Every structure is written in C-alpha cells, then in structure tokens.
Design a protein around this nucleic acid. Sequence first.
DNA 1: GTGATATCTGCTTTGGGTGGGTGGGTGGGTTGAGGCAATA
DNA 2: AAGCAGATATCAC
Lengths: 624, 283, 616
Amino acid sequence: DEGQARKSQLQRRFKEFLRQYRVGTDRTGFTFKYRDELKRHYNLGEYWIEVEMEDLASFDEDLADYLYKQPAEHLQLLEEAAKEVADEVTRPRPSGEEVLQDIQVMLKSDASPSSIRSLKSDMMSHLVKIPGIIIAASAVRAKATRISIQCRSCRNTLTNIAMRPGLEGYALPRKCNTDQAGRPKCPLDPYFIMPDKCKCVDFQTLKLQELPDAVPHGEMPRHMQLYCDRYLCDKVVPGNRVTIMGIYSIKKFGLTTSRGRDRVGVGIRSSYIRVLGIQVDTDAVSPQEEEEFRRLAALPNVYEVISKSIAPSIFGGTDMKKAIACLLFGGSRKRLPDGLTRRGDINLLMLGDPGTAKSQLLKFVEKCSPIGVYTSGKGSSAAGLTASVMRDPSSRNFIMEGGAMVLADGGVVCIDEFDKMREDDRVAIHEAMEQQTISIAKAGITTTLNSRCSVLAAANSVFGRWDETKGEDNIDFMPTILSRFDMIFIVKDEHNEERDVMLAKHVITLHVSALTQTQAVEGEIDLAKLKKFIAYCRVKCGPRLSAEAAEKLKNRYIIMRSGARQHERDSDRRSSIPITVRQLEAIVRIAEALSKMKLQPFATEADVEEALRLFQVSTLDAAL
Amino acid sequence: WSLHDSLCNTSYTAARFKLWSVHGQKRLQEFLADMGLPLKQVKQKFQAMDISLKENLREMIEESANKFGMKDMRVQTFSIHFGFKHKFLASDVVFATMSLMESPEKDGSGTDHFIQALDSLSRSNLDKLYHGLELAKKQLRATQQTIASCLCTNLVISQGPFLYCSLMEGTPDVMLFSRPASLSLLSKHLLKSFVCSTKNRRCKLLPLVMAAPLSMEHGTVTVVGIPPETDSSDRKNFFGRAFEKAAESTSSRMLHNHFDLSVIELKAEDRSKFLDALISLLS
Amino acid sequence: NLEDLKGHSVREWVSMAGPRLEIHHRFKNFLRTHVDSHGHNVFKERISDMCKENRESLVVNYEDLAAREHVLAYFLPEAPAELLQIFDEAALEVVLAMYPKYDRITNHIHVRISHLPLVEELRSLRQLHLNQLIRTSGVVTSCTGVLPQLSMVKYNFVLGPFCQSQNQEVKPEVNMEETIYQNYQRIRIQESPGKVAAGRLPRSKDAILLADLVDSCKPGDEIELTGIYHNNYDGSLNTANGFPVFATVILANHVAKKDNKVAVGELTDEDVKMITSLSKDQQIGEKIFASIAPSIYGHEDIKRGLALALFGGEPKNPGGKHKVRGDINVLLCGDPGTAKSQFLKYIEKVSSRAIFTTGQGASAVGLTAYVQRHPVSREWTLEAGALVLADRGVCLIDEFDKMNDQDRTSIHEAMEQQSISISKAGIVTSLQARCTVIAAANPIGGRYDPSLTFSENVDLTEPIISRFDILCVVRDTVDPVQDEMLARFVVGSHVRHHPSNTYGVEPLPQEVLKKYIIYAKERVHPKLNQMDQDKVAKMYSDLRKESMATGSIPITVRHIESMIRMAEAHARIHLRDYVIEDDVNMAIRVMLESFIDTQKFSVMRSMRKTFARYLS
DNA sequence: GTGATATCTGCTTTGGGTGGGTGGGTGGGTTGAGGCAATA
DNA sequence: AAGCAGATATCAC
Ligand SMILES: Nc1ncnc2c1ncn2[C@@H]1O[C@H](COP(=O)(O)OP(=O)(O)OP(=O)(O)O)[C@@H](O)[C@H]1O
Ligand SMILES: Nc1ncnc2c1ncn2[C@@H]1O[C@H](COP(=O)(O)OP(=O)(O)O)[C@@H](O)[C@H]1O
Ligand SMILES: [K+]
Ligand SMILES: [K+]
Ligand SMILES: [Mg+2]
Ligand SMILES: [Mg+2]
Ligand SMILES: [Zn+2]
C-alpha cells in the first residue's frame, strides 16, 4: 500500500511534467513541447518520444535525481505516465485505433560523457553516458514482454505475466494452483509457455569499442556489450560513432548452477548496458539544412569553394584537391536494359616522391567521406580486403565476414602504401574495382556481395624518388590494375627557390597556429557540413551527359587514342599507362561528378571541358 | 560552465592560484580537496552535477577560499528567472553582451556586431544570449592563454614610472585583442595577475601601458594605459593627458578616436620615441 | 607485551580484541609520526597526494614499518589478511582526520606494502608459503577485462546483507540494486624468458586483483607482485591427478613495474625541487648531453641527438584535422666497433618503456601487429607487436641494414602517421603506435667510404631515409692522439668498473637523469609562439638547393618539421614552457651539421662555407 | 520409546549451441581457409 | 527415464 502510494505519486509527478512543460517566452509565444511531440508521433504511428534530462530537472529536480540514481523503476513510471498522456492528447480516435499503444521513452542529456574505462562497480545500476564506436551488430531477435503459461495436466492457465526488461529471464511456478482433491496431483514443473499468447518486441545486441584517442598507451582497445530494443533496434551499424545513455546492469540468468557451473572465479557476473538513447556523432536532413545545401549548390564558384575546403592545411596540390573532390561526389551508376551495369565510382592513384602529403590527403578523405575506411597495403591480405570464410564459435559452421571493401561499400576505401602490397593480394581487388561485387566459392558457400566503393591509393615509385632517366622502369604495376584507375597522378617534388620559401612559411605558420583558438574561414566549408553536403548530393542527383557534351567528348577521345598509339610506336615500348574504353568512361564519370556538385540533371560542355583538363594533367601527363 | 573551468578561467582565482604556473595546478587540487568535491563532479557541467553538492556550495566555497587567502569570493549581485529553464546572473549577461559586441567573427562588421548585442538584450532573442555565452567562454580561455604567455616569458618590463607590455604578431590569439575594448580588458586582467604573481614590491604599485598591433597596412599600434591595481583604488586614470603631452612634445602621429582618452592609435615607428617622452614626463 | 604469545598462533593472537586494539593504535601512531632522514612527515605528504588525486590506496614501505614497528613487521607476513584489515581501518581513521569530507569520495582505504624482503621465484613456491605474504616477479601473459564481483549480497522481502569470499558461493534471487560489487581482475604471471633455462617450459601462476588494483598491469609487462599465497579445494584437479591436490592463487596486494622505473606521481616535492634547481644551471644542456652513455669516449653528436630523441618534441593537431607527430627518430650508421650497439643498449636501459630488437630477429608482423589463430573461441584475434607495445616509448633496432626488405617496409606507416592499420581475417582496424625509433646500421661493405656520399654508402632508399629526423655518421679514423686518448679512457673504464669496486662538465647521476626526464616529458609542454620565419624559410631553400646539386640525401618538408621538433625538445630539456630563439638556433645547427656530414670529403669544405652564417 | 530401515520427494541429468564467448580450452566436439615462420 | 541425496514415517525390540 505505502509502496503503491509512493509509486502513484511519482507517476503523477511525471504525468504533470509531461502535461505542463512549455518552451518559449511571453514576448514570443509558448509551446507544450512534449505533449505536442507525443500527440504528433502517436498520430504518425511512431510510439516513442525523447525526453531531455535538463528539462525534467528544470520542472522537478528530484525527479531527475531519482531517474539518474534508480533508472529502472522511475523509467517504468515515466513510460506509464507517457501512455496516460498519449491517451488524453489523442483520446477520441478513429476506427481500427481503439487499443492504446505502449510508448517508449528515450533519454537525452547535455552532460559531458564518461569513458568505458571509467565504468566502475560503484556505478552499477546507474544511468551512464558513454561514447564509442559500433564494431558489431547482431541480428534482430524477439524478446517477450508478456507471457501466458498453461498447466500440462489440468490446462489451468495464468495469463498476462509481465516480463522484466533487458537480459533477464523468468522463473516459472514450481507447483500448480489446481484443487488437490479428486484429480491425480499435477507434476512438478507443470507449466509451459503458450506460443500464440506471447507479446514480443524486437531486440538487438551491439559491441561498443572505446574511442581511439581514449585508449591508454600500449593497450588494445576495450569494448562493451549493448542491449537495444523496440525503436532503438537497427538504428546504428558497424562503423558509427555514437554516444549512448543507458543503465549499467548485470545479466540475470537462472539461479540454478545447471550443467554443474564451474567458473574460474566465484561470485563473478557479466555486465552490459541497457540502452535508453542513442546519438550518432558526425565524426535525415532538416529542411533548414536542405535549404542551405541548395544555396551552396547554386553558388557560381561552388567548385572552387569545395576544392579549397579539401585538406586546407596542405600548402598546394590544387589539381589533386580538385580530383579528390570529384571522387568524393562520384558519378552516376547505371543499369542498362540487358542487365549490364556501368559503375559510377571514381578511382584515383597518387604515385610520387616522399614527403609530398600523400598520406595526409588520404587521412583527410577518411574523415571527410560519409563512409570512409583507411587501410595499409602492407597490413592487408586478399581475404582481409574483400571478405573471409571462418568458423562460427556458437554454430560450429562456416560463415562470412566482410573485409575493408565490404565495410566501405557506398563510400571510399583509402589504401596507403599501395606499392608494398603483395601481388597475390593486389590481384584480389580487380573484380571489386570494376564489377563492384565480390564472388566467393569456398567451404560450401557460394554467394556474391556488394562492394560499390571508390579506391583512393597512394604509392612510391620503384626507386624511391622518380628518376626521369629510368623512364618506364619507375612504374611496377601491371596494365590490368592501372587501367582500373580513372586518374593517375605522378607527384614529383620539384625544387624551386620561390615555392620552397612559400611552403616553409606556410608550414611554420601552421605549427604556430596550433595554439590559436579555432576560427572560421570565409571561403571554405567546415568538414562537418561538407560531409553532410556530399551525402545529400549523392542521394538526390544522378546526372547524365547532354547530347552536345557527348559529341565533344567523342572527338577528343579519338584524338587521345591516336596520340597514345603514335607515342608508343615512336618510343618502341608499349607504355605503362594504357588508354582504353575505361578511360573514356572515366571522363564521363568526372563530368557527372562536377554536375552533381551543382545539383544539375545534365552535364554540360563546360563540365566535359574541366573533366578533360583534369584527365590531361593526371593520366595523359603520366602516359606521355 | 563546469566549476573546474570557471575556477580556471576567472581572473580572480586564476591570478591567486597562479594557474599559469606548474604549482598552481597543485594548489587548485588542494583547494578542491579541502572542499571535498569529487574531481569528476567539479569537471562535469554545473547543471548536470549532483544536487547534493549544490545545497551549501556558496558557503563552503567561501570558507575554503578564506582558508586559502581569498576573502572576496562573495559579491552582492542580482539574478533573473523566467520560465522553467531560464536563469541568469547579471555578470553572465554582461559577459555575453560584451562577447557579442567584440566578436572576432569578421564576416560581420562592428555596426553588425552592435546590432546583435542590442538584440540579445531582449527576451525574444534568447538564442543570441546563449550564443554570446559560448563566445564569452572562448574569449575567457583566450585571455588566460595570453596572460600565461605574457607572464611566463617576462614580457611585462618595468620602465621607471610604469610597466610596459607589448603584444607581437607572432602571438597566437593577438587577433582577438586588436579591438580597443578587448585590449583594455585584457590589460586590466593582466595587471591583476602580474600584481598577484610578482616579487618586487615596487612593481606592484605601478600602472601599466600596453600596446598591440592594429593595422599591418599602415603600421599602426593601439596603446592603452591603466592605473595601479589596488584593493581600494579610486579607479582614476591620468594616461590620456600624459599621452597627449608626450605626443605633442615629441611630434608623433597619434589619433584619439575612442571615447576614452586613455586609448590611442600610434604610428609604430614613432612608438619607441613616444615612450621615452612618456617616461621623462612621468618620472 | 604484544610479542609474547600465550600459546596461540599469530593469527589467533591478532584475532582477539586486546592485541587487535594495540596493533591499531601502533599503526595509527606510525602513520602520524614517521619521519624520513631530513625529518619530513612522510605520510602527511603521501596522504595529501592521495586525496588530491582522489585515490584510495596508501602505499607503505616495508623497511620503514620494520624500522619503527618491528613487531608489526614480524606479524605481517604470517597473518596478512587480519593485519591488512586492521591497517585499512587505521588508515581510514587517519585520512578522515586529515580530510573530514573525504568520506564522500570513498569509504575504504587500501594499505599496500612495497619492498617486501621475502622475494621468491615462481618455481620456488612450496606449501610452507601458504597463507603468507610473498613477493615474486614475472611476465603477464594473460589478463581478463575488469569484471563485477559480489561483495555484499542481498536477496529477494529482501534478505539481510551477506559477505562474499574468494573460495565458495554464499548460501542464503539477487537484488541488483541493493547489492554491492567490487572490481575483479584475473592475471596469469609467467617466468620471464631471460630467467628460464634454455629449452625448458616456463612455470606460471594465477593472481587476483581487486578494487583499485585492477588495470595495474598489462600483458607483456615485467611485474613484481606482492600478495597472499592462497589454496582452495578443487574437485576437477583432484579428478585429474588422482590425489587430493589443492588449487593455488595469489591474492594480490601490491603490483609494481620494478625494472628501474619511477612514475611522475611517485616523484616527491624534494625531487621536484632538485630538478628545478638543476634546470636553473646555465650548462644544464651540456650536463644532460654528457649523461648519455658516460662509459663511451666522446661521440658528442650522437649523444646530443640521442638526448634530443629521449626528450622528444610536441605533437600538434591544429584544428583536429591535421596530425603532426612529436617524436624524433634517429639513425646511426658507421664503421664496425664504434659502440653503436652500446648506445642502443644504454637507451634501452635508461628509458621507461623500451623494446630492443635486432636485424633478422624481427619480422614484419612482430614489429607492428599480428593475427593470432585460436582452436576454440573466435578463430582470429589481433595482438600487439613491438611498435604498439612501445607506444609512447622507444623501439631500438640493431643491424638495421641486415633486415629483410619486406620486414623493413612494415614500419613506414608507424614512423610518420604513428599508427598501424590491419585489414586481415575479418579485422579492419587501426592501433596507436607513437614511438621513437632509434636504429643502427652498417654501411655497404662494412666500411664507410669518405669518397662517397651517405646515399651511396647505404642500401636504404629515400622514403625510409626521410623518416629519420637525425642522421649520424660514425667514422673510425686513425689518429695517434685520438687513439691514445681512446685507449687511456677504455682501460680506465675497465679499471673503474672492476667488480671489487670532453664536454668538461660533470654528468648527472643516472637516477637523477631518469627523474629529470620523466618530469620534463610529463609536466612540460613547450609552446612554439614566435619564430624567425624568414631565417628558417631561407635556410630551407638553401638546403634544398644544395641537396639537389650533390644528391647526398633527400630533403623534404619533413626536414622543416624535424627542426621544430628539435627546438621543442631543446626547450623541454631546459624545462621551458615556451620555445625561444636559442632553441631554434640549436635545432638549426644540429640539422646543418648532420647534412654536411653526408657529403663527400672534397665537398665538405665548400658546404661549411655555404652555411657558415648559420653555423656561427 | 529409540534405532534402524523402508518409503517417498525433489534435483538434474544429456553434452549444445536460445546457455555464454565478459567462463576456460589442463573440462570435451574433421574440415576448411587463413595467417605465420621457416622454407625453397 | 534413471539414480542419488535428502526427508520422513514406520516397524521391531
Ligand atoms: N605541401 C605540404 N603542405 C603542408 N604540409 C606538408 C606538405 N607536404 C608535406 N607536408 C607535411 O610533411 C609530412 C609529410 O609526410 P606524409 O606522410 O604526408 O608524406 P607522403 O608524401 O605520404 O610520403 P611517403 O611517400 O614517404 O609516405 C607531413 O607532416 C605533412 O603534413
Ligand atoms: N668510443 C668508445 N668508447 C668506449 N668503448 C668503446 C668505444 N668504441 C667501441 N667501444 C667498445 O667496443 C666494443 C664493441 O662495440 P660495439 O657495440 O660492437 O659497436 P658496433 O656495434 O658499432 O660494432 C664495445 O664493448 C664497446 O664498449
Ligand atoms: K560448457
Ligand atoms: K564450449
Ligand atoms: Mg605516406
Ligand atoms: Mg653492433
Ligand atoms: Zn494443475
């Protein structure tokens, strides 16, 4: 009774918070924020809301303190209050919407996060805020919220038994409640779960790795298990950087020591986090963002603005920064009626001298790309890059795990030290670079995966520094791999008095400026916005060449082929850099990328002119 | 903000703890230990901090500060509350408005920065006030960094009658202190820190003259003068007339454009010359 | 009298109330009154340091306790659990007396014993050590995550509190909210490879770490472990052996990395006073240079470069999108028998975290990171190599020219981007590797030819050579005066270091230098605020002009950033929080002197003349 | 009326992957593909 | 279903 009274009072306070909370001022106006959000979400068929802890503290500090210290009970009370308020906001309801739905209440806060390493025993059963990286996600499974049980002998049924949230089970009644007289006694453990009477929700399990910068020196990164349910399920994927609010909890399995439990230490338990809210970190588009993106795409010098924003810390490399912008946006993937596909992704290779910021460029593109994976050729294998076959520990069966080019599907994979890769490992990438699939036939698995990613590779020349006398001996790659690159840049560290003085002053100023507090630059776009702008354009615009632009491209391609053919004849050596139909389609992709920057449905002659200029400076220069 | 950040970026406590030094951090840790506040709590944002610690915070801070040689930790002021959320102390509003007005974001002119500051004072433009609070945090951090750079390198050199500190273009945050009001406030904070952290008794009773670059095209420098820092100072300043008398006697190219006569614009080449006259005038 | 036992064991004696109270009072008095040689209250400073950092452990040196409380010292090894509990209670009383509000931070203080005189090997532990306080040493081979263990249990009405021991399940469902937990960790300790006889299988023990003791060590660490040797009945052991054999474990009390290592926290106020006073000296740079391998006749450029590499530069990341390393890599190359290996061994001995490896003994994955196969769990896992294990440390590579080329190319990413990227067997990840690489190599043909350039003498190519901030050429020239000086120094060194027993400045003692280095790397972060950009820019252009003309070595932008690291390292040696002009001048001189040494003998005179203005 | 001694009751077993890989492979499970070091 | 551990009522002397 007294406990019931206390619970009812707390639920009433949560209900009043939901009914009365307001944002605004008497000069402007007022909005009942949470009541309105609940009403709109329920009408949309989305039975969840997100509540800020600061708002709750503003309304009632004690309620927020209780929610922080004892999250489970008070969160249950808050959900019941949310259900009550959802009935009142929507209470006269249309036919087929009679039954009131449960409301999931998500939690959000402005507090500073805490690390995995800082999670101690004294914080058990508390509300915690943790940053990390998603490294693994399980399949979506069913978790019972309500069960009905029936007696084997007498068919006596107990219905609507509530289940605990999280990774917690239930202990069935030991004995039945039927009358002792007349009937032979019911057997021990008489109850079984009725399949069709059970109410279930979707659940998921995740692994959260600590942030790379938080790892103590010389230690392998640690991870933690996450439990997600209902609308939190299937929100994040491996590779996402997130901040999670949750309950630090313990797995509650059977009390019995079944199979003769024989742990290496006594009284140990398994920890996990019961997730109450997820926030994806930058490192859907609001209408304000969409309007801002449309404004950027319409700037007459948008191409210059984007190029200036790519690795602004690097001193020069304007042509290579322009080509990287095209790679980030990409071309238009197409499927012809016969079923054959033409890829829209752009591949770029930087081959050149040491200390020319090739690795710094690759690191930037990893941060800038909406989907980006950085790997090293030396530290890679054929199975690691594409996909692997291995034994599943639980099932005792063969499974498949994706490599770098599966994790980078839909984005960019940056392969540094490309020359150090073994020939057998390099050759495993040919199919993925052109057909954009990975074919596997191993250990009884015959399947095909998607690998629609752009390759950005860096390498050194054969003799360390490019030697003009050695000629074609500077390049070691086969013609097959080189023909799969849209643009090939030969980077030569040219020594000049005037440029060297300018570069040195830039580098010194860069090191001194590390102390300066960060400031915006008028002519550039910050990385966070550029990252979002790229993602928006790739989903919204797939351009095509205009009929006039195609005629211009056709005529220049024929000239380029004749010049390459003539050059090989005169030199008596077949050139290392080939000029094939793939290079014609490469120019099409680069032209479409330039249009996609401007959100233009058709690529013009100016787009083809710029695409041909980029090709001239990159690949024709290498080939001649 | 967080209590730790507030303690580190308040010129009063930052000057008395000598947080620009290596032993100042240890002294701050000792202060917090005397309070009994867990480090993780004081490093958390004040709003998110556990309410049990907030019950007697002002009294306990006053007592601990009294033990540590700060007797003026408490000031009489005012606060304004509206809504469920909105609560502000007067000094917070002052700092936010100042930061909006003296913003370093040069995309907007100074008449544009004035308009933002004026708008922020109306409750309809609350978002501007919060933005100004963030800008104020950045400005306070920059001020402490500049003070540390000046005090650690011994850039405050005593001429006979006054102390002289000059900012150079190599300084990282110099841009944030090119505007005269920011330079004046920085000079006052710097003098307070210097007086707290110096050994010479004479240098504690001196006024300060501070210079910072204004325009690299015309070679102009902003010069400010402030009086000695004392607990009972009458807050009276004699540097405007002294500057006008030095410039006249030496024939330098000075401009009086600020409404305060102690802020001047000087041709950099004349600077040296100017100063000598000033010295001879005040000694 | 406490010493006199009326026919009880020590455990029984300390279990009863009278002796318990006497022990409590004696330990409290020891904490309150113990003073060092100078007369300073040791535990007043130790407790202040503990509380300022919000820590829960008080470390007691066994020798001090034995000197002041000999009876308690005698009791401690025989009845460790009871004595340690009493010590914990007394320590909590004293701490709360000094800091009455500390009870909000913690309710328990752990007393941890160091310098226990009863050292034993893992192989030597016998049944007579059971339930005693023992000190052993070894290698951490396996380490669990930090796990929650029941401490004070509550059951569902809700049952009364129940304590949990390390040996059996308690006998009353558990109430998660009302229960109390503790941090738990299990480590496996193994015989160090240098102590096990060749061809023999090492011995191993298990250890349990509790509360704030967790995460005190990592796999691969050399540790000294003080704890309680504990045995418990195990049925499956009995089954296996056919005899009633009990399982054993170490209940850890104190974990130290004791291979001559002192942490920044362990430095005392007097130590910092001495370090600061030393830094005030006008010749401190020369004294620190002279402290590098004092038993080597002068190779003054090598010692200077190694000191700079030891102190290190400052990492920078201007806007979070442009990372620049702060580490300084060194390459020694010269004639045989010039003490290159001795320099590397000295660096290994003086550094806090150093890994030494040689030539063909290092493989590509062993240096960076490797993929371990398993028969039963997840098939594939990622494990740290030398560079990962030496993160924020030093990796020394001897016989650098004798390495396999494929193995030598595996350090390129770690030397510049300071990370290792692995994409293997379903693992796609990057690990931190921020380590100073110091390598020693021999020239082509085993002799450095002065008629050639450095690039002609070695088989290394431009990409690897550019990753080395400092290049040192060691030349063995025949000069009668120098030969006599070297002979008289070496024979005197053999006289001085009999087991029975150039700068012109007295070097620092090695223990003093180790304290100085740790303080500077932890408490000093020199800032580059101002620099003569024109002088540095003009110098860089001149260097690139001469490098292209002669081809002695490649010059890249990396050479500008190395100068800034060297200026920062020089300022750190002086405990300066801001880099000044004399740091930049020293860094310029170091870089120009190195460049001139890479020229042919004929060109060397012209090169000094070209850069004379800087070298002045 | 106490000491067997006969009857009755509840536990958990099996090897198994909805019981974990945050138990451990010195507690015990074919087949193939995938990294290493040594190899040629 | 099969078997050991525990509980307990029951004959016998
Ligand atoms: N043009 C430049 N502007 C600014 N910084 C530069 C420039 N070129 C090089 N750097 C800096 O110099 C160093 C060059 O190292 P980096 O790893 O980027 O070179 P790399 O060209 O990839 O060389 P390698 O082929 O040897 O791997 C980095 O610190 C980079 O920031
Ligand atoms: N300059 C020197 N001063 C003192 N000892 C030296 C010197 N040069 C060589 N030695 C001694 O010669 C021995 C061989 O040197 P070593 O370490 O093998 O050099 P390297 O590896 O360059 O051949 C060492 O034991 C070292 O003590
Ligand atoms: K098992
Ligand atoms: K198993
Ligand atoms: Mg590189
Ligand atoms: Mg050697
Ligand atoms: Zn029944």
